[PDB]
Write a protein that binds this ligand. Structure first.
Ligand SMILES: Nc1nc2c(ncn2[C@@H]2O[C@H](COP(=O)(O)OP(=O)(O)NP(=O)(O)O)[C@@H](O)[C@H]2O)c(=O)[nH]1
Lengths: 205, 509, 85, 62
RNA sequence: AAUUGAAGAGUUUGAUCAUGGCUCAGAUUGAACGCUGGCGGCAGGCCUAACACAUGCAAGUCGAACGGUAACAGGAAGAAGCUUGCUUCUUUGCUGACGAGUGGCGGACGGGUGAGUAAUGUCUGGGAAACUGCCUGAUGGAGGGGGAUAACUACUGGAAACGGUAGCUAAUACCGCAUAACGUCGCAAGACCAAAGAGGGGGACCUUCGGGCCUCUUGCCAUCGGAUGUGCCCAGAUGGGAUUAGCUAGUAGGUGGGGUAACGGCUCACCUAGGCGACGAUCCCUAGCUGGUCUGAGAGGAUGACCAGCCACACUGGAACUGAGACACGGUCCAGACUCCUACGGGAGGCAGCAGUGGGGAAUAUUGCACAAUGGGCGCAAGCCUGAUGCAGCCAUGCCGCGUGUAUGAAGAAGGCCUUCGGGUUGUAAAGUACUUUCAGCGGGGAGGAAGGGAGUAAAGUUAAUACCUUUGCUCAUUGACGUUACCCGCAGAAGAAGCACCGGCUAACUCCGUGCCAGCAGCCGCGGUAAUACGGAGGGUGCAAGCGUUAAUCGGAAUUACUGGGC
């Protein structure tokens, strides 16, 4: 239940930086981003009204690395949950364990964050968690265990994690190599360029 | 198959010959059974293995009937057995079926011991058998060819003591190799289909080991064994490399014979079994494309296109492959016969449907009609015939074929007449006055109109009329009259030849 | 199939043969009651009524007549004998 | 009932009972069905590479 | 805080707008087929032949009802081969137990099936005219006798199944007598009806020295209640067809008699001529119904697998018995069809129980393990039995989680494909370099499902009694089918693991080559007759993932049956 192919093709086909190539370097410079999506990608960017609805869903799925069947449950869960359906969609995705591991700066990329979580090196409230789709709630503390601590994979991630946005909704800490989820992320703190109204539309028909 | 453990085993023995050397009698007397002539046909048309307990040690017996039809059974029975026995009669001597059994002994490199069947009849002498079979390298006696002859009554029940001893010794002189525990493997004697029990097979196990939980794989068929049956015994817990045990619980009826190997897990053996099906299916479509394309033309070059179809389902798997080969022997260029949908047993809906599409006879070596089968057969017009023996079957199929033929070999003239002084008629356009010089002219019999030895016109008479009488028959040297449709020009001097048409009929051979 | 309650079959046969004799006698005492009701005998009807009274109540206590079937005989047959009497 | 044979060429004729998937495509008047390829006795399409699921073509060893 | 949610597109024409059908995007399934395929968890798994079946098992259990030794386990006694410590082989029910037999209770539960049944059905809401084992509450009896019988012996009919005749024997089997209201039958007076012992132990007056008796537990009998089940009645709702409009003699009602546990044409005799029906009787066709399931914004529509309630059915047809309850799945008989055994006279058998087979069909399973647990049956209990159940096996059938790497990496390599031959694209992809070892494989450790029950003790209860027994503590042994369990730790190395449809528009995703109304595609409108983004292959791409398609099925779209919500 993972992609495994080229991460930049997913970035190229969208025409937006997914932060999958980040790791050590950043801001692309060398790219070939957009411009030839396929072999005949140099053809004009004119596209259907239906296609841009699907194109938004693919952006959100290719960022977080989620499959359509697993992602079908998050719309179904976000719709039944109260308030705005679009705001609940990204809120449930933002509460994934792989992503919370990525936001605190343990993994240098989102796939690498799912990679480390799979190996049972991440522990919520003391207890270990294998599943990357583990839903993180308020007052949950998540940290790397004693085995495989202070490795160059996790150490280099936390070094360059300070250069990013540094999210307010969770404490970076990184002193004892741990983290804490303070509260549920706001609408202003995420989204912006990725729209929720476009992805929420696609499921209605 | 590890540890290299070597344990002695009971020798498996097969017996061959010309039909009638009382080959069966030898077994039944030892078995103290006498099932002979208790079954339809009076002879053994099936194969079975029976183990008996007699001093010294243990021994089992296997038997296959010798006939032109069973090419495969005698071939497989030879290679499976460690020792082969050839029955021979002083009255019968050597016969072309017996020499056929000679080849199976040498080609399978199996040592052979033989027995003289009749010491009872005064016209029977051993010296005749020894000398006449001397010419063949097989069966030397005291010439330094290590082969030993036995003289038994087979009716008298006379020893035997010698034959038994030779068999034990012949198995004793050669090293007996087997193992009590290990990976089980072996060959299949005969397979058939049962209604309650399900698909079953009679299996000789080379390495002797078994268990209800062990997974067994026979050919392209796989499955877990539900139960085990040995001869009369309904249930056996364990089975050794010596004694044969009927296997049960396999997915479907396997091949008439093949190598069987048990496996640890069934899941690992599923892909292997399906793999063998793919190859057997690929060659099936391969042989299908060749035979159709072989003619290299859209039809047959001649008139043999008329053929007969048959549908066969036999209870036993061993027969359908074996007798079909003999069923293809009776095939001829004129009438071609082919088998369609050979079954493992009984009868079924799709089988009766198979005979419904193309007209065919539905026959079985041994079968009973299912409740759903009777409804279809009774409704549409069909034929259900079951035959206890293969000989009564091989004769009637030929009979079906012989009848199919429609030959008329006679075109002899009925009468010859010359026409003179043509008359005009409104209906036929002409009436040619005639005078019959020879024979009798008839109405519906065809005629050949010829002038100057070449045939100007041909046809069949429509109206034969003399005067206003319009008689259907006119003799020779009696004034006669004739007219026919589609004949424009009547000229004097020509002669009309009328001839009757008869069919000789045909026979197959 | 040789199975479990073939012992109960011969017991139910013995119980049938037992109860069939006791139900038959019970009714033949009731048969003598209407012999006097069909006739004009008041004394013989009450005589046969007091003969059936012990036996019929004894069947309900045994548990074969089933309580009210026994009581219904005496209920109706009390009403029958005193129409003319 | 009449049935359409998909793919280029076939070995089907006379005997050998075949599977029928169904579904209607309109071209030869009266056809309401389609035959299954690579099922029971029916051969799949030879030398085909794209669309192997349709027409019973197996994956070649690469 | 809780049924808070409504999409359209394509196609009539030269073109347009209505009207209007067809078609597609969605979800769903007890699925199948085609191709492919790593693991785990949970659930699902003969939808057709209510077609028929091999074999084992699916209900037995009480010696604390009773006569008993048929088994082997001891103990005891005796006789022997002898080693001086033992085996060996006949006796003895002394005993732990228990074949068969009599008796008690359960075989009416559990499990299966969807053939019938369009209403002796079901769902919903009421009613009165009933019974109801085991289990509980209340007030009293459990006195005294008799005649039989299976088992087992003596014979005999049989091939087998299964008997016959004559003896003998116990009981919680059976039948009289006595006992008799609060019960039954009556206005009343009255009449009338019941039973059974067994086991624990024990001081005292005591035995024909069995045990009375006292006491404990258990069971029987009778009546009045409770609970539970079940019977029965009424109303409404619960399919299609008017190309079925008339249908009914026990039919509708009464009286009397009989009948049922109980009201009743329930069943008879007689009397009267009614009864049902356009608000669809009757007939015909199809069907178990419901909680729900699926779809839908809702209203509705379709549907009745699994789970649970009710009903019917148990090879077909019909009937009765036993019993509290059955008009009886593995019970009885009779008839029909079918199969097996046979000495040919005669018997035995019913997988729509769990597995499994023939056969049907596109297609759906292991002839498994355990009573460890849960709920039943019996018993005082141990404990026995339990294909119910709990588990495992099998299949991707469905649903859900996870893996098949991660980071770095331009030479934007090689090769493929295209190219106006400048280059682009596959492509950070690969290789290379640096990291990690989940799930698998291998080696270790190790929860929970497990409370009881058993054997000794301590005290308080019962009691004439510190017997006994019940309850409550304590301590000592234990009882896991699943189970190489779940889970945790270590070892080795990117090692063992990605395919399928599709890319003309609808509809996300394009060029070349080959073929040339040929071969084929296609859901709809349509492509191909020599520049095919529509076929076939290739490169590239998109969707989706141990799944992906096709097909079939129902709803949605369909405001195209429109009550909500349309026209004439
Ligand atoms: N005189 C005599 N006749 C014998 C003797 N042994 C057998 N037979 C005859 O052989 C006959 C039995 O033959 P059988 O064994 O059935 O032959 P078979 O083995 O079936 N032949 P095949 O193998 O070809 O099928 C009997 O009828 C008997 O008369 C014997 O010793 N003496």
């Amino acid at each position: 239940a993972r992609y495994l192919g080229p991460k930049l093709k997913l970035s190229r086909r969208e025409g937006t930086d997914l932060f999958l190539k980040s790791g050590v370097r950043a801001i692309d410079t060398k790219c070939k981003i957009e411009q030839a999506p396929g072999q005949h990608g140099a053809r004009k960017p004119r596209l259907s009204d239906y296609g841009v609805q699907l194109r938004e869903k693919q952006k959100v799925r290719r960022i977080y690395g989620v499959l359509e069947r697993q992602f079908r449950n998050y719309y179904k869960e976000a719709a039944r949950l109260k308030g705005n359906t679009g705001e609940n969609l990204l809120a449930l995705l933002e509460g994934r364990l792989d992503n919370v591991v990525y936001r605190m700066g343990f993994g240098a990329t989102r796939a690498e964050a799912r990679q480390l979580v799979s190996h049972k090196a991440i522990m919520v409230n003391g207890r270990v968690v294998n599943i990357a789709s583990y839903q993180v709630s308020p007052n949950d503390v998540v940290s790397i265990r004693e085995k495989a601590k202070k490795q160059s994979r996790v150490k280099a991630a936390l070094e360059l994690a300070e250069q990013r946005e540094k999210p307010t909704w969770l404490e970076v800490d990184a002193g004892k190599m741990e983290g804490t989820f303070k509260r549920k992320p706001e609408r202003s703190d995420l989204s912006a360029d990725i729209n929720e109204h476009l992805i929420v539309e696609l499921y209605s028909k | 198959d590890t540890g290299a453990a070597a344990e002695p085993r009971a020798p498996v023995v097969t017996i061959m010959g010309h039909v009638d050397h009382g080959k069966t009698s030898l077994l039944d007397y030892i078995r103290s059974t006498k099932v002979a002539s208790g079954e339809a046909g009076g002879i053994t048309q099936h194969i079975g293995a029976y183990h008996v307990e007699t001093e010294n040690g243990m021994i089992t017996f296997l038997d296959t009937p010798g006939h032109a039809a069973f090419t495969s059974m005698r071939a497989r029975g030879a290679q499976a057995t460690d020792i082969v026995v050839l029955v021979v009669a002083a009255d019968d001597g050597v016969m072309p079926q017996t020499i056929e059994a000679i080849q199976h002994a040498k080609a399978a490199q199996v040592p052979v011991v033989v027995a003289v069947n009749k010491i009872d009849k005064p016209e029977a002498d051993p010296d005749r058998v020894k000398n006449e079979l001397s010419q063949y390298g097989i069966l030397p006696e005291e010439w330094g060819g290590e082969s030993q002859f036995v003289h038994v009554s087979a009716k008298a029940g006379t020893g035997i003591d010698e034959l038994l001893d030779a068999i034990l010794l012949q198995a004793e002189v050669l090293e007996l190799k087997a193992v009590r525990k290990g990976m089980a493997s072996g060959a299949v004697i005969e397979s058939f289909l049962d209604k309650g029990r399900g698909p079953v097979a009679t299996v000789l196990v080379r390495e002797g080991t078994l268990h209800k939980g062990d997974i067994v794989l026979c050919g392209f068929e796989y499955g877990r064994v539900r139960a085990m049956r040995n001869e009369l015994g309904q249930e056996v817990l364990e089975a050794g490399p010596s004694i044969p045990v009927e296997i049960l619980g396999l997915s479907g009826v396997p091949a008439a014979g093949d190598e069987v190997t048990v496996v640890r897990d069934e899941k690992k053996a599923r892909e292997v079994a399906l793999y063998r099906q793919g190859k057997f299916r690929e060659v099936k479509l391969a042989r299908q494309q060749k035979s159709k394309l072989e003619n290299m033309f859209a039809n047959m070059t001649e008139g043999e296109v008329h053929e007969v179809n048959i549908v066969l389902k036999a209870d036993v798997q061993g027969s359908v492959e074996a007798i079909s080969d003999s069923l293809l022997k009776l095939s001829t260029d004129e009438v071609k016969v082919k088998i369609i949908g050979s079954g493992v047993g009984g009868i079924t809906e799709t089988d009766a449907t198979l005979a419904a599409a193309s007209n065919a006879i539905l026959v079985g070596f041994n079968v009973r009609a299912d409740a759903s089968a009777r409804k279809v057969i009774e409704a549409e017009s069909l034929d259900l015939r079951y035959y206890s023996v293969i000989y009564n079957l091989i004769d009637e199929v030929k009979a079906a074929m012989s009848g199919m033929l429609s030959p008329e070999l006679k075109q002899q003239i009925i009468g010859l007449a010359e026409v003179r002084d043509v008359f005009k008629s409104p209906k036929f356009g002409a009436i040619a006055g005639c005078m019959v010089t020879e024979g009798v002219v008839k109405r519906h019999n065809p005629i050949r109109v010829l002038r100057d030895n070449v045939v100007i016109y041909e046809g069949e008479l429509e109206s034969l009329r003399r005067f206003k009488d319009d008689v259907n028959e006119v003799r020779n040297g009696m004034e006669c009259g004739i007219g026919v449709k589609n004949y424009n020009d009547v000229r004097t001097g020509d002669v009309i030849e009328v001839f009757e048409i008869i069919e000789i009929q045909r026979t197959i051979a | 199939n040789i199975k479990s309650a073939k012992k109960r079959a011969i017991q139910s046969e013995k119980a049938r043969k037992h109860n069939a004799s006791r139900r038959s006698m019970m009714r033949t005492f009731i048969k003598k009651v209407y012999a006097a009701i069909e006739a004009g005998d008041k004394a013989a009807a009450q005589k046969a009524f007091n003969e059936m009274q012990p036996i019929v109540d004894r069947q309900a206590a045994k548990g074969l007549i089933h309580k009210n079937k026994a009581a219904r005989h005496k209920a109706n047959l009390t009403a029958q004998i005193n129409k003319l009497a | 009932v009449t049935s359409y044979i998909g793919g280029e060429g076939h070995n089907l004729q006379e005997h050998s009972v075949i599977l029928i998937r169904g579904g209607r495509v309109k071209d030869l008047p009266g056809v309401r069905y389609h035959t299954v390829r690579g099922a029971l006795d029916c051969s799949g399409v030879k030398d085909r590479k794209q669309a192997r699921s349709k027409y019973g073509v197996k994956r070649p060893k690469a």
